Amino acid sequence: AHGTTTLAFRFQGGIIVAVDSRATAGNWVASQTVKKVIEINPFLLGTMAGGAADCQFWETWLGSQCRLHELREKERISVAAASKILSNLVYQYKGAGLSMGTMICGYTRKEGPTIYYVDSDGTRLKGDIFCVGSGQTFAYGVLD
Amino acid sequence: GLSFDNYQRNNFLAENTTIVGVKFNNGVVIAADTRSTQGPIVADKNCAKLHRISPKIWCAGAGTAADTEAVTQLIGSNIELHSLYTSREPRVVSALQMLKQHLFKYQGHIGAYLIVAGVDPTGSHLFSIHAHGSTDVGYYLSLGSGSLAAMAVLESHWKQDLTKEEAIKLASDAIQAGIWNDLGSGSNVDVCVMEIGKDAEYLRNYTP
Amino acid sequence: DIILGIRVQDSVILASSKAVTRGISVLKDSDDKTRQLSPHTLMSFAGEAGDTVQFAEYIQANIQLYSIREDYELSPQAVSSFVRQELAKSIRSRRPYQVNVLIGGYDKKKNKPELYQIDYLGTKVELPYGAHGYSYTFFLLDHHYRPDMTTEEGLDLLKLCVQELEKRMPMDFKGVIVKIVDKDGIRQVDD
Amino acid sequence: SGYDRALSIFSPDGHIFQVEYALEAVKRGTCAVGVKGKNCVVLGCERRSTLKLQDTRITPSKVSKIDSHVVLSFSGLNADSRILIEKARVEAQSHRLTLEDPVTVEYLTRYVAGVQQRYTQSGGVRPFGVSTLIAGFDPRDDEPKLYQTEPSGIYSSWSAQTIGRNSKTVREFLEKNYDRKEPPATVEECVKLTVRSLLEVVQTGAKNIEITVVKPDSDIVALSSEEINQYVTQIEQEKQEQQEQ
Amino acid sequence: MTDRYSFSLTTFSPSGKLGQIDYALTAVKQGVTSLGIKATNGVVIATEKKSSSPLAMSETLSKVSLLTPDIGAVYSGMGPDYRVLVDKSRKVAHTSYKRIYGEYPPTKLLVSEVAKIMQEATQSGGVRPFGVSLLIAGHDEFNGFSLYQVDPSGSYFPWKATAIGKGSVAAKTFLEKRWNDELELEDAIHIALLTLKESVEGEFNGDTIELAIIGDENPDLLGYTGIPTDKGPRFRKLTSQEINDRLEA
Amino acid sequence: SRRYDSRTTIFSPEGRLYQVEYALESISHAGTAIGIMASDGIVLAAERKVTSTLLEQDTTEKLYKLNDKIAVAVAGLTADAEILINTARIHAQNYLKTYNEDIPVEILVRRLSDIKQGYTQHGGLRPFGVSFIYAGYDDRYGYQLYTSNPSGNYTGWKAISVGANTSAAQTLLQMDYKDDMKVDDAIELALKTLSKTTDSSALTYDRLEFATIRKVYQKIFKPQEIKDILVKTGIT
Amino acid sequence: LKKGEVSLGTSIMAVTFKDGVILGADSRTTTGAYIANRVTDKLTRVHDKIWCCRSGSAADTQAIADIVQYHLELYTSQYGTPSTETAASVFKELCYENKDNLTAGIIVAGYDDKNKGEVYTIPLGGSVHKLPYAIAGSGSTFIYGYCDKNFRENMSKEETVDFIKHSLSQAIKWDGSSGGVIRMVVLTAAGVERLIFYPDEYEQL
Amino acid sequence: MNIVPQDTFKSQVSTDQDKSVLSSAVPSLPDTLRQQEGGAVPLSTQLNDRHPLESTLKNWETTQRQRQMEQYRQIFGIAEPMKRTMEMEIVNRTDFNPLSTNGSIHRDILLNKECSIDWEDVYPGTMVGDDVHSKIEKQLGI
Amino acid sequence: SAAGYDRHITIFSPEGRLYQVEYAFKATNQTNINSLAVRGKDCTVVISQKKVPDKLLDPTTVSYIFCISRTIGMVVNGPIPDARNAALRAKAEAAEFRYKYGYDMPCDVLAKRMANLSQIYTQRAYMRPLGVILTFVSVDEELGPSIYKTDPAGYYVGYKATATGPKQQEITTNLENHFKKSKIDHINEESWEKVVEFAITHMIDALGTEFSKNDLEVGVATKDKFFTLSAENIEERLVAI
Amino acid sequence: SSINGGIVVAMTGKDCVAIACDLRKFEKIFHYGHVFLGITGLATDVTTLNEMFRYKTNLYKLKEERAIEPETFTQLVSSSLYERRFGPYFVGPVVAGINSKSGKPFIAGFDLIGCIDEAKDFIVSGTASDQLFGMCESLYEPNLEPEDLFETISQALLNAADRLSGWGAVVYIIKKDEVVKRYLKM
């Protein structure tokens, strides 16, 4: 996945997620624009920042898990629960070869707006502002 | 059974005698030296190395000492149970088979090298046993770091017609050569004599 | 990751630093190196990412289950022994991972504070002092420690240790979170 | 007839009789009652009169805390309830570990009902002769939850429910004296209603009644004998004043 | 599946009794008489040999078995169950004790292992209880001499003297009238012979009764010499000639 | 009924478990055991049922040691009791190994009761059919006395009896128990109750097992001590 | 080949002749340059008239030979005397199915009234080959020419004895891991014959 | 006809490969609390850095038994291995002793190990589990 | 007969008996033939009665004598299917013993092994005993001539001589009288042919009415081999006194 | 906090034994009745072995109804160590005691997989290379009275200490009747 800058923060009534869409050309022509952020649900988003296949596959799988949970409990899943599911899954395969760093961003009635960061090492960090990319110090300084 | 726990932990932490057996016309003799060394230091100047699988089947070992002791004791328990089960005196071939299969199962990871002598209703028997599970028959055998001097002595004065006294003298002389010429061997000479139709005679500190 | 523990006459003081995982610009207000095992027993941990948090949460779940089952609170000594057993059991069939744990409690039955340190191999030591992470502080602690210190004197000693440590940290040493465990429970020092 | 010898047999009219027999076993246990208030839940239990030589300080209570916000009472075989309660507590801790969120009341009720159903699926096992009442509040929520579970694995949601011995009289009393349009708006009203419901079957009085109160933000309180005695005396005084007129 | 289990073969009767254990006790009571007498210097264990036909060689089948060099056992009931339990006891003496502590177990612990094995057969879904009763005599350093009786249910008790089998009540009375705290091993052997004389209907000679003793160490039975600290076996089975000589006297 | 009593995992039409009831009924065929907790200790007494001559009294069928602070009196089948006693000893040692503290009595009692209850819930297992009187001391509750039956239920007591004459013994204990008694008074009361309720001609020393727990040590009385106390109390 | 193990450095020959088969070998076992066993019987019997010689790991071949003897005893209890082909097939199956973990090579010689004397060879790897004669071991490489120049079909017993003696004497002369006495087993319809030849006899050939 | 056990490595992995311990909240993930393994043991760590002899020792007796069954099939027919397997399965299935782990006497007789001892015999060998009910559930399949 | 259970499985009756075991015992006399086993000085002889009433049968395929190993022979009383099952298991047992302990299986040890298997059958509910009686004969290298018998109850014992069948009592009495007369627990003859002739004579005088060469089956065990005789050998033995 | 590593000395007198260990509370000497065990090596393994042997000796006393003798305890330690043949504890254990029935002294040492060395004079563990073994060889004499034995072992430890941090010693003198435990914080 592209090491391009990815930004996420939570101001007062939601989450702003910002990416740079400067795609990299190769021996191909794209029918439409690619997206650096995976749409897990109509309410959940994630970022790739790692191995493209790992992020796509496991975030689609996470969307399936969240859908099944919401069907069972008749309520939207909390962002903490979804991030914990993803973290447990990636930790079960720790050291096997996976590589993925994702930012799970959501907004629920009970929690509010929440951002978590999940890594292929099993890290799971809750936060207010996240900047992950090639050059992220400049963006973090501008935000602060 | 034997555990493999903390194998990875131990790897991570790491990354940071003279024995002889002789055969005479009515039995066998097994002899050994009595020096125990924890490296260059003499831990014990009088240590018994002749071990009893059964009252008339004896053995002496080299290699990993704990492995030798444990394997000898386990085979002794099996031999005792089998002899009770069959109501018959144990045979040397049975102990040989049990030892060979147990050592072959562990693929050489149990470091026991043995000389096994004995008598049974079928006669007198002497065998050598290797840590990987191979065994061999012989009329005279040597083992340990002093085995070459002992084997030279044995090749000097061995013949088909040997009485009990001559066999005892020859085994004692082989152990003596190991004692004098090898740094790992020394001190006393322990002997065990087994005859066809008699009790086993265990002579601790025979010559000295 | 740096963890410090000081036991005084009436309480235990635990100081821990922030994470800064790897080149990720994070603004947050929480302590991710501390789990409350029980109302009078606290645990601080420092080590490899992923494994250490999993182990800490597993220990916390087990202790909460015991508390619910018996309607009773384990002593800090029993908690530390259980933690040592679980840590030694985890690396039973795998490569060991870097982890260091400080357990600070207040035995109500004995009415006294206690502090234990457990390393990555499973070595548990009862101590009046304790530190893990950056490697001098032992000399200063030995020079300025008394078994009968009050809470204020312990906090002053901890401030001295923090000031000494800050002069060698690469200026990214943010606010160290300090917690106190005593007969009234567990609280966090604002300063 | 010959249709009640196993759990895997339907009768010609479509019944499984061993389930009804487990319910019969439940019917012999001491009475339990649960009343849902506007902002609280009250669980009341009937206790057999303590024997003279019995040590009344260490015997387990009739209301057990599964977690800091959920309580459970039972009726039926006392030894099976220990197994069910232990499994419920283990499941609550496992859910907290797996999803960082404590269970909801309905989730725990469904887990208990699942265990009870799973113990009806073999010819070599015996179903639990226990019926349970599970009460609490969802985390960061203020809606009281009360559920009932049965030996077959069926669970239901109630505003007020009684199980156990002579539970029909208590249920009729509750139906007469409880309306969902105007639930009791204070803890005192709910506790008084629970006491009066239990007094219809309890032979002696305040010494055979246990009461636990659950309030939001995980507030679980077990009332002492003196408070229950005060409630009973107040109810008796009101009844005497009514009868005097 | 309906084959992942099997219902219990031993259940409580309405009176509160386990019927299979009682029937095993009846099977024991239909067996041949065996006895044990505990003296100050040893223990005598005796039984009556039986034969389907005179053409059978009674020496091939022995009701007296050495469990350890210092522990022996005798029986009343069904022979194959005896053989199975004796093999198991001989194995357990090594697996549980001698491979751990380097020494043979005391009498009581071996009796406990045998009794646990017998008890596990009364709470099963596919084996009946053992229909046999056990007499175990032994000696150990810290307890001296001991005699135990083990029942089909797995209960065991220590006895000064006891008998099991068809003629157990009369033998028990005869031993009650003929026991004291100062008896010797030879006196115990004589009393055992007299007691067995009252139960054997046929020939009471050395080829129809079987005796063994737990007495003093026999260094002549070790099979090797040279170690003064190696004690010989204390279990010794009397030959037929010795029994005949004692009967003549 | 004969239709609903063959298996342990089947309910009767009235909701009863007949195998459990028969296991409970089997207890009355065992010798009486009495436990009395005083203000400074616990007394366990047991009347041997199968007492007769030629039995080695010096070498215990009813009083057992679980650890240095917990003891048990047994009523019922002794082999099942030995199985459960070995299990309880292993559990106590496991708790000591894990927590470096002595196990509380109630935890051990609950573990054994759970084992019994589980043995009432599998088609291939029959109930144990034993009753235990637990006497223990722990730092949380002090001295405590429990009983457990084959059904898996356990109860705490001040003075309790199990076995052949539970009703009469309980009547006597109710009429004669005081909360402030000492260990000697409890010893006298237990011996008097055993002498009154026994169906034998007289209460001698060879038909008694006696134990005490007091500050903490456990004293398992030898036959000579039993005879001495019998002489002292006037029972003789 | 595991480190510290024992290898079967030897000289093995098996020759079919007019009346049956003969199997011959030397009697030396060496660990490195030290002769661990000066007198070894390498002629292993797996059935009354089915014999073999082994090469490679000593422990692996001993285990395989024990299993083969057990298998042939079961077969005999069921169907009677097996053929040499059956024993060769069992040897081949054992050697091939375990070739990733054991190092074994076998020369099988046999006699039966149907096939009238046969030789099979199973080299390292587990393949089987049927030959009028076979040679194996470290010392065999030095007699590939000589044997190829001196073997005739349907030789008499004495001619076969002389051929085997000469070939094994040359192999002993040139190979360090070979020496001692020559042992031979003659398998015919008349029974089993054992022969031994001493260094003072064959070294003068 | 195998002497040393073969094909001991796993070919596939999944987060639900252990059916005995699965999370009720997320059925596709394992339950870390009820595993009781220290809480920091991912399955991936079990795929590497094992002692080479461990798999050989763990599967040795099964391999010898399979070789014996194959020999019986070759020499005697289908009926002999069928009968041996049926006997062993009946004996193993009728035994349920949650309080003990020792093998039965009849199993030892069938295995021809009445008078044989190995290190498995000498060395036969929490907050959650290890109770009778867990064994009941595992045995009955419920 | 069995009242409730005990008609299917092996559990105790109120009298303390196992009815299925006794019924398996009664099943051993279905074939209605007799066998005799005697010991010589260096041989052991087993003689079994052949009954072939059907004229369509091939007599050479009817046999109740089996060869278990090189030195052990077995004779079975009872139906032939269980006989063949037992024979195959005994062959496997002897071969496995030889593989595991390095020397040949003795007759008494094999008898004990089969008896232990029978004990398994008598104790397990879902297993039935085999309705056969097994007699093993050999010349053991330690114990000399040996005869050992095993029955469905798991009981085994050795014999100086033995007989089994519907008419075993008469042969047993005749053998007992002969051994009383001779005061020797064996037969004092130097060849197995004389022992075979003596066993044939004993069988003839016990059963009565004599027989031809096709009504008999003879197995002989020496120190090296156990072998079954053919019809011509039995004819020679009958002719030679 | 360091802890890893140490030294243990055991010596045999006339009717007494002595066992001593170094010290910086973590102590390397434990007792299971009248049997004493000193362990050198990894702290984790020392704690684990102590807990395991306390477990096993408590079970042994409950079953046998008597305290375990030094010889039987030596065999138990050997078997327990050999159980972990391929994952062994990094420990050097030493056992000291007096046999209750006979009164004879007993000392033994073990390797990490359970090989038993039964020495009649003395046993050194932890570092028997630098100076401790030589000092004990030059200082030990047979058949010493308990006061003489205590002086000899204390002097050996003191001489080893001088060969600079806070160093102490713990010494046990064991006779058939009583056990005397002293400290040497110098």
What Rg, from alpha-carbon coordinates, does chain J have? 16
Count of domains forming chain G:
1
Token pair in block for residue C124: 């548990």
Strands C3-7 and C131-132, how do they pair? antiparallel
Residue B59 near residue B199, CB atoms below 8 Å: no
Residue G113 Cα distances to C119, G73, G133, G191, angstroms: 76, 19, 19, 12
CA-to-CA distance for D176 and D196, rounded, in angstroms? 12
G32 Cβ under 8 Å from any chain B Cβ: no
CA-to-CA distance for E70 and E233, rounded, in angstroms? 6
CA-to-CA distance for I11 and E24, rounded, in angstroms? 9
Side chain identity at residue D185, one-letter code = A
3-state secondary structure at position G74 = helix
For D67, counting Cβ atoms within 10 Å of its Cβ (0-12 exposed, 13-18 middle, 19+ buried), the class is buried
CA-to-CA distance for G169 and G25, rounded, in angstroms? 10
Token pair in block for residue J51: 């807990």
Torsion of CA I92, I94, I98, I99, to 10 degrees: 10
Count of domains forming chain D:
1
- Mind telling me how many Å the CA of D22 is from chain C's nearest CA? 27
DSSP lists the bridge partners of residue F157 as: D54, F145
D175 Cβ under 8 Å from any chain C Cβ: no
Token pair in block for residue D99: 């999803």
Q: Which residue has the tokens 């010096």?
A: F58
Q: Which of J35, J64, J69, J116 should one mutate to test binding to chain E, selecting the residue with the greatest count of E CBs within 10 A?
A: J64
Tell me how crowded residue D165 is: count the other CB atoms within 10 A of its CB: 17
Q: What is the secondary structure of B4-59 as a DSSP string?
A: -TTHHHHHHHHH---EEEEEETTEEEEEEE--EESSSSEEESS----EEEETTEEE
Which residues of G are marked as active site? Answer: 10
Residue of chain H minimizing CA distance to G70: H71
Contact E28 I16 (CB under 8 A): yes
CA-based nearest residue to J155, from J165, J140, J174: J140
CA-to-CA distance for I225 and D245, rounded, in angstroms? 116
Contact F156 D17 (CB under 8 A): no
Q: Which residue has the tokens 């072939």?
A: I52
Token pair in block for residue G56: 């490679």
- Output b/e per residue, C82-112; b: 16+ Cβ within 10 A: bbbbbbbbbbbbbebbebbbbbbbbbeeeee
CA-based nearest residue to J84, from B46, B4, H137, G31: B4
Q: Which residue has the tokens 């009652």?
A: D33
Which residues of A are marked as active site? Answer: 4
Chain J residues with CB under 8 Å of C124 CB are: 47
**Superfamily of F1-236 according to CATH:** Aminohydrolase, N-terminal nucleophile (Ntn) domain (3.60.20.10)
CA-to-CA distance for J90 and B10, rounded, in angstroms? 9
Residue E80 near residue I115, CB atoms below 8 Å: yes
CA-to-CA distance for A39 and A47, rounded, in angstroms? 9
3-state secondary structure at position G28 = coil
CA-based nearest residue to F160, from F44, F77, F80: F44
Residue E150 Cα distances to E25, E133, E155, H11, angstroms: 11, 6, 6, 53
Q: Which residues does E118 contact at the CB level (< 8 Å), separation at least 6?
A: E85, E129, E130, E150, E151, E152, E153, E154, F79
Strands G44-47 and G50-56, how do they pair? antiparallel
Chain E residues with CB under 8 Å of I157 CB are: 52, 56-57, 60-61
Residue D174 near residue D160, CB atoms below 8 Å: yes
Phi then psi for residue I87, to 5 deg, are -60, -45
CA-to-CA distance for F55 and E131, rounded, in angstroms? 24
Residue G184 near residue G23, CB atoms below 8 Å: yes
Sheet with strand J179-183: strands edge to edge: J122-125, J8-12, J16-23, J168-175, J179-183
Chain breaks in chain E (C to N over 2.5 A) after: none
Residue A51 near residue A98, CB atoms below 8 Å: yes
- Mind telling me how many Å the CA of A68 is from chain H's nearest CA? 9
Residue B54 near residue B116, CB atoms below 8 Å: no
Side chain identity at residue D175, one-letter code = E
For I144, counting Cβ atoms within 10 Å of its Cβ (0-12 exposed, 13-18 middle, 19+ buried), the class is middle
Any chains having at least 3 CB pairs less than 8 A from chain H are A, B, C, D, E, F, G, I, J
Architecture, CATH, for domain E1-249:
4-Layer Sandwich (3.60)
C54 Cβ under 8 Å from any chain D Cβ: no
Q: Experimental method for this entry? A: cryo-EM
Any chains having at least 3 CB pairs less than 8 A from chain E are B, D, F, H, I, J
CA-to-CA distance for B70 and E217, rounded, in angstroms? 28
Q: Which residue has the tokens 């291939």?
A: F124
Residues 53-72 of I with CB under 8 A from G: 67-69
- Mind telling me how many Å the CA of B24 is from chain H's nearest CA? 33
**Dihedral of alpha carbons I75, I81, I87, I90, sign:** negative
Residues 171-200 of F with CB under 8 A from E: none
Token pair in block for residue I216: 């008999």
CA-to-CA distance for D82 and D92, rounded, in angstroms? 15
Torsion of CA E55, E58, E63, E64, to 10 degrees: 180
CA-based nearest residue to C100, from C79, C124, C129: C124
E57 Cβ under 8 Å from any chain B Cβ: no
DSSP lists the bridge partners of residue I157 as: I149
CA-to-CA distance for D193 and D191, rounded, in angstroms? 5
Here the CATH number for the domain that contains residue D60 is 3.60.20.10
CA angle B169, B175, B181 (to 5 degrees): 130
- Mind telling me how many Å the CA of B94 is from chain I's nearest CA? 5
Domain membership of residue D218 as a residue range = 2-241
Element (H, E) at D17: helix D17-27
A52 known member of a binding site: yes
For D26, counting Cβ atoms within 10 Å of its Cβ (0-12 exposed, 13-18 middle, 19+ buried), the class is buried
DSSP lists the bridge partners of residue F34 as: F45, F161
CA angle I175, I176, I177 (to 5 degrees): 90
Residues 148-167 of C with CB under 8 A from A: none
Chain H residues with CB under 8 Å of C57 CB are: 39
Contact A127 C28 (CB under 8 A): yes
Q: Which residues does H73 contact at the CB level (< 8 Å), separation at least 6?
A: H80, H81
Residue F8 near residue D126, CB atoms below 8 Å: yes
Phi then psi for residue I28, to 5 deg, are -75, -15
Task: Report how far apart the first and last C-alpha atoms of chain H are (Å, whole number).
Answer: 37
Residue J30 near residue J36, CB atoms below 8 Å: yes
CA-based nearest residue to C118, from C107, C104, C108: C104
CA F66 to chain centre: 12
For F57, counting Cβ atoms within 10 Å of its Cβ (0-12 exposed, 13-18 middle, 19+ buried), the class is middle
Torsion of CA I14, I20, I22, I27, to 10 degrees: 160
Closest Cβ–Cβ partner in E101, E106, E109 for J75: E101
F with C: 3 or more CB pairs under 8 Å? yes
Domain membership of residue A49 as a residue range = 4-144
How many cross-chain Cβ pairs, B to H, lie less than 8 Å apart?
Answer: 41
What Rg, from alpha-carbon coordinates, does chain C have? 16
Q: Which of H29, H31, H41 should one mutate to test binding to chain A, selecting the residue with the greatest count of A CBs within 10 A?
A: H29
Phi then psi for residue E13, to 5 deg, are -75, 160
Domain membership of residue G176 as a residue range = 7-205
Chain breaks in chain D (C to N over 2.5 A) after: none
CA-to-CA distance for A37 and G16, rounded, in angstroms? 80
Q: What is the secondary structure of H45-114 as a DSSP string?
A: GGGSS--HHHHHHHTHHHHHHHHHHHHHHHHT-SHHHHHHHHHHHHHHHH---TT--PPPHHHHHHTT-T
Residue A75 Cα distances to A80, D63, D107, D139, H76, angstroms: 14, 29, 12, 14, 65
Element (H, E) at C5: strand C3-7
- What is the stated resolution of the deposited model, in angstroms? 2.3
E40 Cβ under 8 Å from any chain F Cβ: no
Spell out the SS3 assignment of B149-163.
HHHHHHHHCCCCCCC
C with J: 3 or more CB pairs under 8 Å? yes
Question: What is the residue extent of each domain of chain E?
Answer: 1-249
Token pair in block for residue G88: 């060769």
Strands B200-203 and E224-225, how do they pair? parallel
- Residue G45: inside a domain: yes
Q: What is the secondary structure of J2-28 as a DSSP string?
A: ------EEEEE-SSEEEEEEEE----S
CB-side neighbour CA atoms (13 Å) of H78: 0
A with G: 3 or more CB pairs under 8 Å? no
For F75, counting Cβ atoms within 10 Å of its Cβ (0-12 exposed, 13-18 middle, 19+ buried), the class is buried
Contact C61 D65 (CB under 8 A): no
Domains for chain I: give ranges and CATH numbers.
4-241 (3.60.20.10)
CA-to-CA distance for I63 and A138, rounded, in angstroms? 100
How many cross-chain Cβ pairs, E to J, lie less than 8 Å apart?
Answer: 21
CA I160 to chain centre: 13
Tell me how crowded residue D200 is: count the other CB atoms within 10 A of its CB: 14
Residue J181 near residue J171, CB atoms below 8 Å: yes
Torsion of CA F109, F114, F117, F121, to 10 degrees: -170
Q: Which residues does D241 contact at the CB level (< 8 Å), separation at least 6?
A: none
- Output b/e per residue, E213-234; b: 16+ Cβ within 10 A: bbbebeeeebebbbeeeeeebb
Q: Which of B17, B18, B34, B72 is catalytic?
A: B17
For I124, counting Cβ atoms within 10 Å of its Cβ (0-12 exposed, 13-18 middle, 19+ buried), the class is buried
Residue A17 near residue A40, CB atoms below 8 Å: no
Residue H120 Cα distances to B7, G64, H102, angstroms: 19, 25, 10
Closest Cβ–Cβ partner in G6, G34, G36 for B132: G6
Tell me how crowded residue G149 is: count the other CB atoms within 10 A of its CB: 8
Here the CATH number for the domain that contains residue G116 is 3.60.20.10
How many residues would you count in chain B?
208
For residue E97, give the DSSP letter: I
CA-to-CA distance for C40 and I191, rounded, in angstroms? 95
Q: Which residue has the tokens 């004499």?
A: J141
CA-to-CA distance for F165 and F194, rounded, in angstroms? 9
